[PDB]
Design a protein around this ligand. Structure first.
Ligand SMILES: *[C@@](C)(CO)[C@](*)(O)[C@H](CC(C)C)NC(=O)[C@H](Cc1ccccc1)NC(=O)[C@H](CC(C)C)NC(=O)[C@H](CCc1ccccc1)NC(=O)CN1CCOCC1
Ligand SMILES: *[C@@](C)(CO)[C@](*)(O)[C@H](CC(C)C)NC(=O)[C@H](Cc1ccccc1)NC(=O)[C@H](CC(C)C)NC(=O)[C@H](CCc1ccccc1)NC(=O)CN1CCOCC1
Ligand SMILES: *[C@@](C)(CO)[C@](*)(O)[C@H](CC(C)C)NC(=O)[C@H](Cc1ccccc1)NC(=O)[C@H](CC(C)C)NC(=O)[C@H](CCc1ccccc1)NC(=O)CN1CCOCC1
Ligand SMILES: [Cl-]
Ligand SMILES: [Cl-]
Ligand SMILES: [Mg+2]
Ligand SMILES: [Mg+2]
Ligand SMILES: [Mg+2]
Ligand SMILES: [Mg+2]
Lengths: 196, 222, 195, 204, 218, 233, 222, 196, 195
C-alpha cells in the first residue's frame, strides 16, 4: 500500500492507491482503502486487509453506538478507539491506519497509528510500503493551510511517485475530501498521474 | 536455498510381447500446477532397436538419454559396429546411473527392445542403477495407478480358472501387439482421469525385428 | 518394562512377562511382576512408559473391583477389554496420554472359553490366539505361527512358551532377567513358580 | 508417525444394477509387523453399511459411536436410518472434531429402502462428503484402487458380475501395497438380501 | 524419488554345504515396487552374495566383486578364498563409509582350504564369519524358525526346506517381505539353484501339509 | 547457491504461420522496489534469433556477453559466417541449455528462465524454453513467471495445438501478445507499462520494436467501487 | 479449484469447475462447488473442501433463521458479514475462499471472501488455483453493461481457462444465474467438455475368476 | 549510507554522507565514501566498509596497470572492472558502488553497480540505505544538462533529506566535482544543510 | 562391541572381552573375539564404532608385524602403545576419525614385567594395574579398587575377573554373551577356553 492524509485550510483530504497483493500477484487492482467510520471521520488502511477491515468495522460500530448516546464524536475520540484495538491486540495485528476527520471547532485533523498501536497527531501523515519513497518529496513540498486544489495536487504528485517506485502500490489514486461543505470522492487514473 | 531438482510429472509404461515390445509415455510436461507443454516427447529411439525413457526430472532425464545415445555411438566406434544388445545396454545404463550415486539422476528409467533370441524385453531402473528384466513395468507419477492393473491383465495375477475352486491359476500367455496397445491406451485414459499430471497426449513406440514404429493418441487436456 | 507375551490354548490363557526393571545403565530389579488381577478370572499384563504402566494398571483394577462389588458379579473378559480400550482411547487425545500397552487374559465362565486380548496405548484392541507387545513379537509371532495349534493343552502351551523365551534370550540385545508366567483358567489365576 | 498409515488397510465400494458392493481387507499391523488377519473394517447399522480405513483405534471408536447414534435414531424416529441421512450424520460427526480429527477414511454404502436407489459415498478425515455414481476408494492403497476401479469398472453390473470386478480391484490393489492384504471380505448388497464372501488371496 | 530398498535374506552352514534363501519383494514406502526381485547375486559359479539394504549398492558392488575375483584367479592361477573375496568387498565399502552406502550382505562360498564359509559384510564396515546369518526387515521372524530347527547334520533336502520355511515365516508377518522364495545350495563344485517359489501358493501348501498357521482361515 | 537480486519478470512468446513473436517488459526490479526502467530483456543474436531472459539481471548480462562472444567465435575462420554456417536458433539454444544444466549441476545456477525464439535456415519456427534447473521444453506458446499463469491461457486460445499455427497470422498473433502484456500489467506487481516486442519472420526477417506501451486499459469502473461490502459512500 | 463471479445488467452470475483433488489424485470428477445460502444468495467455494461446505451451511442456516425472525428476504451483505466475521475469528485456519453473490431487496451484489476474513467488491472476480487463468480471460473480455447471455458466456469461458490450463481444475462447468425479480436458476453441469472416450476393451471377468474361501448370508433385519 | 552521482553540462558530480555504523553506534562520523580509482574516475561506496575498500583498492591497482600499458582508461572500462569483481564474488560481497568519471570525448558518465554485480549506465544514480527516502524527490527534481551550481544544489537538497530520514546516514555532505577544469572537493556541514 | 577389561597382576596381563556383536534388535554373533595379537608378547583388545574397530586393529597389527620382520626384533609393549596412541592422536583431527578404544596388554621380556595400557579414541594413554572401556568401568573399577592386590597370581587374577563379569551380568542392561579371556605372560599369549 501507499496511503496519506493531509490537513489544509478548509479541512482534510485522505488519499490512497488501489492495489491489493498476494505475494507478487495483484488480487485486486481497484481496492477502496479509504473507509468511513463516521459521516466525516474516515481512515486510510494499510497492512493486512483482513485485520484493517475487522478493525474498521468494530470502530464504526463503536462510533455509531457513541453517536446514539453522546452525539457526534471527535476525530480524536475515533483515533483513540482505533488505538485501543491496535495497541491491546498488537501481537495478533498487522495494521497501519491513518485516521482523518473534520470537526467544525477543530477543523481538519490527522492521526496516524503505526504497528505498535501508538498515536501521533500530525499536520499530514504518510504510510504503507510505498510511503518510504516519498518522505523526501512530501517533507520538501508540504505547506500548512494549503488550498483544496493545492492539496489535491500535493497528494496526487506524492502518491504518483510512491506508485511509480513501489511494486506493492498501483492502480487508481482514490481521494476523499472532508470539509464543512460535505464529503467529496475523487478518482485519478494511470493515464493522468503516471505522466506527471 | 537452491534446490537442484524438480518434478516434471508425466508417466511411462513398458510391456514385452513374444516377438515385440512397446514403450509408451504421455506427452504432458508440467511444473507444479502449470502445463509447460502438451506435446514434449520423452520416449526416444536410441538406435540398435533400443527405445528408452527417463521419467521424473526432465533435465536429468534428457541428460541421461543424451549420454546413453552417445554411449551407443561410441560402442560402434570401439567395437567394429557391433550391435548393442538390450542386456548390454541395461548394464551400461546401470553404470551411468550409479556413476552419480551421490548426486542422482532423479528419474525412473525404462528401456525396451528385443533380446538376442528375438524375444521382447523390458528393463527397468531405479534412480541409482538397480535394474531388472520384466514383462511389465509402469513408471512415473501414475505408476501406482497403472501397475496393479498390469499385474491383473498382463500377468493374470489373482485370476483363477472358473470352477476349479481357486486351485488352478489362469495360464500365462503372450499377448498380441493389438491386445497390448489396448491395455496401454486403457491404462493411460484411466490414469488421465485420476491423475492431474497425466494427459494431453499418448505416444507409443513399438519395437519389432523390422524396426521402430510410432503411434500417437489424444488424451484429455484438463 | 519390555517383554510381555500371551498364549490362548484350549482351556486356558497363559501370560509371560519379563522380570527386569532397568533405569539407565542399571538393572534396579530382577523380580518384578508386570501384571494385575482385575477379577478372579481376568488378568492384565502391561508394558510401556515408567510410572504410567502401574498407575494405569491399578486404576483399571480399582474400577473393575468397584464394579464387582456393586453388582456382585464378575464382568466378562470381553467386557473388561472394551472398558480398558475405551480408557486408552480417551487417553490418547488427552493432555498427557497413558503410554501403556496391555494384554488381557481371561476365562469366560459363561462361555467356558479362554480369551486373550491385545490392546496398545492408542486403544487398538484385537482378540488373538497368541499376542505380544514391543519388539517381542518380531521373534515370537513367526515361531508361534509355526508351532501353535488351537487344541493344545496348558502343558503344551508352557512348552511352546519356553521355546519363545529361549529364542528371545538368544537374539534379544537386552537381558530381561527371565519371565513370570501365569495361567488363567476355569479355576482362576495361578503362578508357575519354576520357570 | 503418520496416523493414517500405521495400521494400514483398504476399503472399496461400487454400485451395480439395483445393488451395491462394499469390500475391505483384513490386515491390522503396527507398521512392518503384521498383528491381526481378522480385523474387519466394514460394519452395518440396519441396512446401511459403513467401511472405515485409517487409524484402527478410531475405526473401532467411530463404529461404536455410529452404533450409538443410529440406535438412538431408530428409537426416536421409529425407523431405520437411510444411507443419505447416515452420510450426513457421518459428515456432521467428523467435522465436529475439525481441529482434532479422527484419522480415518470412511465409506458409506447401501440401498435406500423407500426409493430402491443404490447409494455410495466417501469422506475425508474432517467429514467432506464425496458422493459418486460409480465407485469410492479408501486406505493406504487408494492410488492403486483408483487405478484398478477406473479401468475395471463399468455401469449397471449384475450382482454376480459386480462381485468379480470389486474383488479383482481390491486384490490386485492390495498386492501392490505392503500395509494391506492378509485376507479380504466382500459384501454384495441387494434390496432385501446381503451376501458376504471371504476371498482367497496371497498371505504376504 | 525414493529408490528401491528390497527384505528377508538368510544363509546357514551345514553338513552338505550352505543353504541360501531370500524373499523377492522390493518396496518404496508402503508401495510394493516389485514382487520378482533377484536378491541372490551370482558373483561367479562358486560364490553367492545376498541383497539387503540398497538394491543398487548391492547389485553394483557385488558384480564388481565378481570382476575382482576373476582378476584374482587369472593372476594367481587359483580359486579365490571366501575370506579374500569377502574382504575385497568389506574393504571397498569401508572406503565409502559415511557417504551413505546401504548394504547388508552374506558372501557365501565353499573352497578346499576353508570348507563351507559365510561372511556377513556391512556398509558400516563390519565383516563377520559365522554359521547362521539373517538380514532384512523380516530377519527376526526367520531367526525364530532357524534357531529352533537348525542342526549341523541336516540333509540337503531338509536344510533346503528349513530355509524355505524361514522365509515363508517372515513373508507372512513382515509387511515389507514376500513375493516369492529363491533357494540356492552351495557345494564345493559350485552353487545349485533350487527354484522360485511363489509365497501365495507356498503358504497354502505349507499350511495344509504342515498343519501350521491355524490362526489363518483357509 | 545464489539468491537473485535485480530481477526481470515475465517473458512471453508464441508461434504464428510464418514465424515467431516474443516480448518482455523493460523493468529491472530490486525486490518490491521498481529500481531500473531502461532494461532491455530481449537480446537478438544475428538476424534470425531473439533470446528473451527473465530472472537475475546480473546473470542476464553474463549471458548477453556469452552470446556476443558466440557470434565472434563463429565468425573465426568461417567464410560462410553470414550464410550457410551462420548461427541457428537451435545452435544458440543448445549452447545455453548446456550451460544452464552444467551450472545447476555445480550447484551454482544462472538464476534465469530463458526463451529462445527464432526461425531456422529451412524456414521452420524455433521456440524453446530453458531455466536455472536446465529444464527444457517446447510448445506453440511459451511464457515465464506470471506469463506462464496468465499469458499462456490467452495465447493458447489462439494457438491451442500444432494445427492452429498455419491458421494464425502475424496480425492476430501480435494482438494476442500485446493483449497479454496488458493483462500482466494489471495483475503482476513486478511489471512495467513499457515493453519491447520482437518478431522473427521467415520472409520479412527480424523486426525489433522498442518503447512500446500498454494502452486501451479499462479503469473507469473503479469509480463505482466503494468500500469493501456495506459502505455506500 | 477455479471459481468466478460476473455482474450483468439485471443481476449476477457465478460459475465453478467440478474437480476435487487429493494430492495429485482426482478424488471427485464431478463435485458441486456452487452452494445455496438462501434461495437467491449463492456461493462458489474454493480451498479446503470440508470448510467451504461447513461454513456455507452454517451461515445459510443462521440466515434462514434470521429471515424468519425479521420476516424479510435475506441480504447478501448479511451473509458476507456473517461469513467474514466467522472466518476472521478462526484466523485463516478455516480454509474457505468464497465468491458470494445474489439478489435481494437492495439489488444485485457480487463479493469475494478469503480465509483470513478480508472481503472485496467487484464486477468480475475469480478465486482458487486457476484464478489467474480465469482472471486473464476476464481482464481480456469483460466490459461494462453485459447482458445475461454475455455474462454466462464470459463466466464459463473464465472457468474453461482454469479447466484446461490449471491442473488443480478440470471436468465440468457449473453455473448459477441470479437475476432481479426472477427465481435463481442453478445450471448443474452447464458444460461437459471432458467426456471419457469409449474404452478399448471390456474388463468384465468370467464368473468364478475370483477364488472364494467362505460364503454366508448376512442378517440385516431385526 | 546515502550516496549519489549526477551528470551535468560540464561533467559529473559525486555526493555522499560521512556516517559509518556498527549497529546503532556511529563508528565514524567523518568518513570519506568518495574514493579515487583514477585521476578523473571516482566511485561512491555503500555496503560493507571492508568489502568496498578491498574492491576499490583492487580496481585502482588494475586501472594503474591499465594506464601504464594502454593509456587513460574510459569510465566504462572502470565500471567493467568493478562489475567483474562484484559479479564473480557476489556470494562473499556486500557492496553497492556507483562509478562516476569524466572523459573529454564522453563527458560525464555514471554507472551504478548494485549487490548482484549488474551494471547500469544512468544520467544520475542514487544508492545506500538512505536513498530509498529520496527516489520521489530526485525523480521529480532531476533535469539533464544542469549547471554546476544547480547540480550542487540538487545533490545537497537530496542528501539532506536522505540524512534527515535515514538513521544510517548523517554527518557532513562530501562532494567531488569532475570536469575538464580538474577535480574539486566540496564539503557541507549540518548547520547549513539541515535547515534547507 | 561393548565390554573390554584388563587386569595386570604379578607375572601376567589378563584381557577379558565380550563375545556379543549386536546390530539393531538382533544379536548377530555370540562368539566374537575382540582382540588381535600385535606380537608374540603383545595383545590388543578393542571396542567402539562398527568396522572402525577391526580395520584399526588389523592396521596396527600389520604395522607391528612389519617392524618385527624388518628389525628381527620384538617391540616393547611401551613402544607399541606409544605408536598406537600416536595413530589415534593423528586420527582424532582427521576428516573421519577412528572411533576405537583399545587396551594393550603385553609382557616386557627385557624388564620381565607385565604391562597394561589403556588408550581411548582421542589418543589418551595411561598405564594401569587394571583398566576398562565404556560403561564397564563404572561397575568394575570400584570392585577392583577393593579386591585388587599388586602381588596376585594369574589364578587369583582370573577369580577377580570372574567377580567382575558376574557383577556386569547382574547389573548391565544388555546381554553381552560372556567373555573371551586371554593371558599374556613370559611364555606368550594363550586363551582360557572354559570361562
Ligand atoms: C500494501 C500492499 C502493503 O502495505 C497495503 O498495505 C495493502 C493494504 C490494503 C489491501 C488494505 N496490503 C495488502 O494488500 C496485504 C499485504 C499484506 C500481506 C500479508 C500480511 C500483511 C499485509 N495483502 C493481504 O492482506 C492479502 C489480501 C488477500 C489476498 C485478499 N492477503 C494475503 O496476502 C494473505 C494474508 C495472510 C496473512 C499473513 C500474515 C498476516 C496476516 C494475514 N496471505 C496469503 O494468502 C499467503 N499467500 C499464499 C499464496 O502464496 C503467497 C502467499
Ligand atoms: C481446487 C480443485 C483445489 O485444487 C478447489 O480449491 C477444491 C475446492 C472444492 C473441492 C470445494 N479443493 C480441493 O479439492 C481440496 C484441495 C485441498 C487439499 C488439501 C488442503 C486444502 C485444499 N481438497 C480437499 O479438501 C480434499 C477433499 C476430499 C477429496 C473429499 N480433502 C483433502 O485432501 C484432505 C485435506 C483435509 C484437510 C485437513 C486439515 C487441513 C486442511 C485440509 N486430505 C486428506 O484426506 C488426506 N489424508 C487421507 C488419509 O488420512 C490423512 C488425510
Ligand atoms: C550505510 C551505513 C549503509 O548502507 C553505508 O552503506 C556504509 C558504507 C560506508 C561505511 C562505506 N556502511 C556501513 O557503515 C557498514 C554497514 C554494514 C554493516 C554490516 C554489513 C554491511 C554493511 N558498516 C560496516 O561495514 C562496519 C564498519 C566498521 C565498524 C568499521 N562494520 C561492521 O558493522 C561489522 C561488519 C561485519 C560484517 C558483517 C556482514 C558482512 C560484512 C561485514 N560488524 C560488526 O562488527 C558486528 N557488530 C558487533 C557488535 O555488535 C553490533 C554488530
Ligand atoms: Cl481491502
Ligand atoms: Cl569507509
Ligand atoms: Mg487442467
Ligand atoms: Mg508380509
Ligand atoms: Mg567479504
Ligand atoms: Mg540521520
Amino acid at each position: 500500500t501507499s496511503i496519506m492524509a493531509v490537513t489544509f485550510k478548509d479541512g482534510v483530504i485522505l488519499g490512497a492507491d488501489s492495489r491489493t497483493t498476494t505475494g507478487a500477484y495483484i488480487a485486486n487492482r481497484v481496492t477502496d482503502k479509504l473507509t468511513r467510520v463516521h459521516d466525516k471521520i474516515w481512515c486510510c488502511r494499510s497492512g493486512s486487509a483482513a485485520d484493517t477491515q475487522a478493525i474498521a468495522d468494530i470502530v464504526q460500530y463503536h462510533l455509531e453506538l457513541y453517536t446514539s448516546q453522546y452525539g457526534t464524536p471527535s476525530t480524536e475520540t475515533a483515533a483513540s478507539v482505533f488505538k485501543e484495538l491496535c495497541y491491546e491486540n498488537k501481537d495478533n495485528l498487522t495494521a497501519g491506519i491513518i485516521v482523518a476527520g473534520y470537526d467544525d471547532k477543530n477543523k481538519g485533523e490527522v492521526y496516524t497509528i503505526p504497528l505498535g498501536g501508538s498515536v501521533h497527531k500530525l499536520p499530514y501523515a504518510i504510510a504503507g510500503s510505498g510511503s518510504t519513497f516519498i518522505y523526501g518529496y512530501c517533507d520538501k513540498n508540504f505547506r500548512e493551510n494549503m488550498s483544496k486544489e493545492e492539496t489535491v495536487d500535493f497528494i496526487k504528485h506524492s502518491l504518483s511517485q510512491a506508485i511509480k517506485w513501489d511494486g506493492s502500490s498501483g492502480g487508481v489514486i482514490r481521494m476523499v475530501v472532508l470539509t464543512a461543505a460535505g464529503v467529496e470522492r475523487l478518482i485519478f487514473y494511470p493515464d493522468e498521474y503516471e505522466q506527471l | 536455498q537452491f534446490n537442484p531438482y524438480g518434478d516434471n510429472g508425466g508417466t511411462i509404461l513398458g510391456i514385452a510381447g513374444e516377438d515385440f515390445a512397446v514403450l509408451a509415455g504421455d506427452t504432458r510436461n508440467i511444473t507444479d500446477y502449470s502445463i509447460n507443454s502438451r506435446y514434449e516427447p520423452k520416449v526416444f529411439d536410441c538406435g540398435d532397436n533400443i527405445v528408452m525413457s527417463a521419467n521424473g526430472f526432465a533435465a536429468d532425464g534428457d541428460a541421461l538419454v543424451k549420454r546413453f545415445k552417445n554411449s551407443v555411438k561410441w560402442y560402434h566406434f570401439d567395437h567394429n559396429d557391433k550391435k548393442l544388445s538390450i542386456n548390454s545396454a541395461a548394464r551400461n545404463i546401470q553404470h551411468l546411473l550409479y556413476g552419480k550415486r551421490f548426486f542422482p539422476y532423479y528419474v525412473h528409467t525404462i528401456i525396451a527392445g528385443l533380446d538376442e533370441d528375438g524375444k521382447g524385453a523390458v528393463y527397468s531402473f531405479d534412480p541409482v542403477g538397480s535394474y531388472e528384466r520384466e514383462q511389465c513395468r509402469a513408471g512415473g507419477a501414475a505408476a501406482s495407478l497403472i501397475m496393479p492393473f498390469l499385474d491383473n491383465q498382463v500377468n493374470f495375477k489373482n485370476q483363477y480358472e472358473p470352477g476349479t475352486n481357486g486351485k488352478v491359476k489362469k495360464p500365462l500367455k503372450y499377448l498380441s501387439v493389438e491386445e497390448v496397445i489396448k491395455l496401454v491406451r486403457d491404462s493411460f485414459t484411466s490414469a488421465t482421469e485420476r491423475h492431474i499430471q497425466v494427459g494431453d497426449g499418448l505416444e507409443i513406440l513399438i519395437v519389432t525385428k523390422d524396426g521402430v514404429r510410432k503411434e500417437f493418441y489424444e488424451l484429455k487436456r484438463d | 518394562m519390555d517383554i510381555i507375551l500371551g498364549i490362548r490354548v484350549q482351556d486356558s490363557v497363559i501370560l509371560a512377562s519379563s522380570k527386569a526393571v532397568t533405569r539407565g545403565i542399571s538393572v534396579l530389579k530382577d523380580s518384578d511382576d508386570k501384571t494385575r488381577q482385575l477379577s478372579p478370572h481376568t488378568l492384565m499384563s502391561f508394558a510401556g512408559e515408567a510410572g504410567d504402566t502401574v498407575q494405569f494398571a491399578e486404576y483399571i483394577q480399582a474400577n473393575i473391583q468397584l464394579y464387582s462389588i456393586r453388582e456382585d458379579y464378575e464382568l466378562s473378559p470381553q467386557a473388561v477389554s472394551s472398558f480398558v480400550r475405551q480408557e486408552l482411547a480417551k487417553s490418547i487425545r488427552s493432555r498427557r496420554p497413558y503410554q501403556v500397552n496391555v494384554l488381557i487374559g481371561g476365562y469366560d465362565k459363561k462361555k467356558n472359553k479362554p480369551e486373550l486380548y491385545q490392546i496398545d496405548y492408542l486403544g487398538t484392541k484385537v482378540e488373538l490366539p497368541y499376542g505380544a507387545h514391543g519388539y517381542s513379537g518380531f521373534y515370537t509371532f513367526s515361531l508361534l505361527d509355526h508351532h501353535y495349534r488351537p487344541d493344545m493343552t496348558t502343558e503344551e502351551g508352557l512348552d511352546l512358551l519356553k521355546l519363545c523365551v529361549q529364542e528371545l534370550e538368544k537374539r534379544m540385545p537386552m537381558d530381561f532377567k527371565g519371565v513370570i508366567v501365569k495361567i488363567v483358567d476355569k479355576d482362576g489365576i495361578r503362578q508357575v513358580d519354576d520357570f | 508417525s503418520d496416523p493414517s498409515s500405521i495400521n494400514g488397510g483398504i476399503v472399496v465400494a461400487m454400485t451395480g444394477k439395483d445393488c451395491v458392493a462394499i469390500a475391505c481387507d483384513l490386515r491390522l499391523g503396527s507398521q512392518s509387523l503384521g498383528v491381526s488377519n481378522k480385523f474387519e473394517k466394514i460394519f452395518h447399522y440396519g441396512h446401511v453399511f459403513l467401511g472405515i480405513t485409517g487409524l484402527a483405534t478410531d475405526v473401532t471408536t467411530l463404529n461404536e459411536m455410529f452404533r450409538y447414534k443410529t440406535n438412538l435414531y431408530k428409537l426416536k424416529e421409529e425407523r431405520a436410518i437411510e444411507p443419505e441421512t447416515f452420510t450426513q450424520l457421518v459428515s456432521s460427526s467428523l467435522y465436529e472434531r475439525r481441529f482434532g480429527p479422527y484419522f480415518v477414511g470412511p465409506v458409506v454404502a447401501g440401498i435406500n429402502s423407500k426409493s430402491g436407489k443404490p447409494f455410495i459415498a466417501g469422506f475425508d478425515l474432517i467429514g467432506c462428503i464425496d458422493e459418486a455414481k460409480d465407485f469410492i476408494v479408501s486406505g493406504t492403497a487408494s492410488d492403486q484402487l483408483f487405478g484398478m476401479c477406473e479401468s475395471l469398472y463399468e455401469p449397471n453390473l449384475e450382482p454376480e458380475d459386480l462381485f468379480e470386478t470389486i474383488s479383482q480391484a481390491l486384490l490386485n490393489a492390495a498386492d501392490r501395497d505392503a500395509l494391506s492384504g492378509w485376507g479380504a471380505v466382500v459384501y454384495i448388497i441387494k434390496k432385501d438380501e446381503v451376501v458376504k464372501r471371504y476371498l482367497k488371496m496371497r498371505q504376504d | 524419488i525414493k529408490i528401491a530398498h528390497g527384505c528377508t535374506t538368510l544363509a546357514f552352514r551345514f553338513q552338505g554345504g550352505i543353504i541360501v534363501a531370500v524373499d523377492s519383494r522390493a518396496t518404496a514406502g508402503n508401495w510394493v515396487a516389485s514382487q520378482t526381485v533377484k536378491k541372490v547375486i551370482e558373483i561367479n559359479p562358486f560364490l553367492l552374495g545376498t541383497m539387503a539394504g540398497g538394491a543398487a549398492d548391492c547389485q553394483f558392488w557385488e558384480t564388481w566383486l565378481g570382476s575382482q575375483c576373476r582378476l584374482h584367479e587369472l593372476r594367481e592361477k587359483e580359486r579365490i578364498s571366501v575370506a579374500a573375496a569377502s574382504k575385497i568387498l568389506s574393504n571397498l565399502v569401508y572406503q565409502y563409509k559415511g557417504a551413505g552406502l546401504s548394504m547388508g550382505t552374506m558372501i557365501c562360498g565353499y573352497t578346499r582350504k576353508e570348507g563351507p564359509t559365510i561372511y556377513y559384510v556391512d556398509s558400516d564396515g563390519t565383516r563377520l564369519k559365522g554359521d547362521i546369518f539373517c538380514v532384512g526387515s523380516g530377519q527376526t521372524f526367520a531367526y525364530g524358525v532357524l534357531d529352533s530347527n537348525y542342526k549341523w547334520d541336516l540333509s540337503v533336502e531338509d536344510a533346503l526346506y528349513l530355509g524355505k520355511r524361514s522365509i515363508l515365516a517372515a513373508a507372512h508377518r513382515d509387511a515389507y517381505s514376500g513375493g516369492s522364495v529363491n533357494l540356492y545350495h552351495v557345494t564345493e563344485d559350485g552353487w545349485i539353484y533350487h527354484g522360485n517359489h511363489d509365497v501365495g501358493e507356498l503358504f497354502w501348501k505349507v499350511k495344509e501339509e504342515e498343519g501350521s498357521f491355524n490362526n489363518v482361515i483357509g | 547457491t545464489q539468491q537473485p537480486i535485480v530481477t526481470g519478470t515475465s517473458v512471453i512468446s508464441m508461434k504464428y504461420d510464418n514465424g515467431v513473436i516474443i516480448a518482455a517488459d523493460n523493468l529491472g526490479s530490486y525486490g518490491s522496489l521498481l529500481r531500473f526502467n531502461g532494461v532491455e530483456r530481449l537480446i537478438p543474436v544475428g538476424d534470425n534469433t531473439v533470446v528473451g531472459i527473465s530472472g537475475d539481471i546480473s546473470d542476464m548480462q553474463h549471458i548477453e556477453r556469452l552470446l556476443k562472444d558466440l557470434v565472434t567465435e563463429n565468425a573465426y575462420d568461417n567464410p560462410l559466417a553470414d550464410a550457410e554456417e551462420a548461427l541457428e536458433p537451435s545452435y544458440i539454444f543448445e549452447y545455453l541449455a548446456t550451460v544452464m544444466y552444467q551450472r545447476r549441476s555445480k550447484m551454482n545456477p544462472l538464476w534465469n528462465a530463458i526463451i529462445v525464439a527464432g526461425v531456422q535456415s529451412n524456414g521452420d519456427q524455433f521456440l524453446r524454453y530453458v531455466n536455472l534447473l536446465g529444464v527444457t521444453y517446447s510448445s506453440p506458446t511459451l511464457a515465464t513467471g506470471f506469463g506462464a499463469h496468465m499469458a499462456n491461457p490467452l495465447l493458447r486460445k489462439v494457438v491451442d495445438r500444432e494445427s492452429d499455427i498455419p491458421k494464425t497470422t502475424v496480425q492476430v498473433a501480435e494482438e494476442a501478445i500485446v493483449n497479454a502484456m496488458r493483462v500482466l500489467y494489471y495483475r503482476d506487481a513486478r511489471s512495467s507499462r513499457n515493453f519491447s516486442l520482437a518478431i522473427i519472420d521467415k520472409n520479412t526477417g527480424l523486426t525489433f520494436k522498442k518503447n512500446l506501451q500498454v494502452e486501451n486499459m479499462k479503469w473507469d469502473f473503479a469509480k463505482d467501487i466503494k468500500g469493501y461490502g456495506t459502505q455506500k459512500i | 479449484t477455479t471459481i468466478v463471479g460476473v455482474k450483468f445488467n439485471n443481476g449476477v452470475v457465478i460459475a465453478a469447475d467440478t474437480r476435487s483433488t487429493q494430492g495429485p489424485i482426482v478424488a471427485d470428477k464431478n463435485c458441486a462447488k456452487l452452494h445455496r445460502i438462501s434461495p437467491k444468495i449463492w456461493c462458489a467455494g474454493a480451498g479446503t473442501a470440508a470448510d467451504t461446505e461447513a461454513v456455507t451451511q452454517l451461515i445459510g442456516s443462521n440466515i434462514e433463521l434470521h429471515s424468519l425472525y425479521t420476516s424479510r428476504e435475506p441480504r447478501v451483505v448479511s451473509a458476507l458479514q456473517m461469513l467474514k466475521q466467522h472466518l476472521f475469528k478462526y484466523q485463516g485456519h478455516i480454509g474457505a475462499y468464497l465468491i458470494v453473490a445474489g439478489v435481494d431487496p437492495t439489488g444485485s451484489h457480487l463479493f469475494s471472501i478469503h480465509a483470513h476474513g478480508s472481503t472485496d467488491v467487484g464486477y468480475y472476480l475469480s478465486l482458487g488455483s486457476g484464478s489467474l487463468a480465469a482472471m486473464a480471460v476476464l481482464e481480456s473480455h469483460w466490459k461494462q453493461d453485459l447482458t445475461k447471455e454475455e455474462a454466462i458466456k464470459l463466466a464459463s469461458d473464465a472457468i474453461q481457462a482454469g479447466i484446461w490450463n490449471d491442473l488443480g481444475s478440470g471436468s465440468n462447468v457449473d453455473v448459477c444465474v441470479m437475476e432481479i425479480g426472477k427465481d435463481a436458476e442453478y445450471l448443474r453441469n452447464y458444460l461437459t467438455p471432458n467426456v471419457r472416450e469409449e474404452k478399448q476393451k471390456s474388463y468384465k471377468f468370467p464368473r468364478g475368476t475370483t477364488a472364494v474361501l467362505k460364503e454366508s448370508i448376512v442378517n440385516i433385519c431385526d
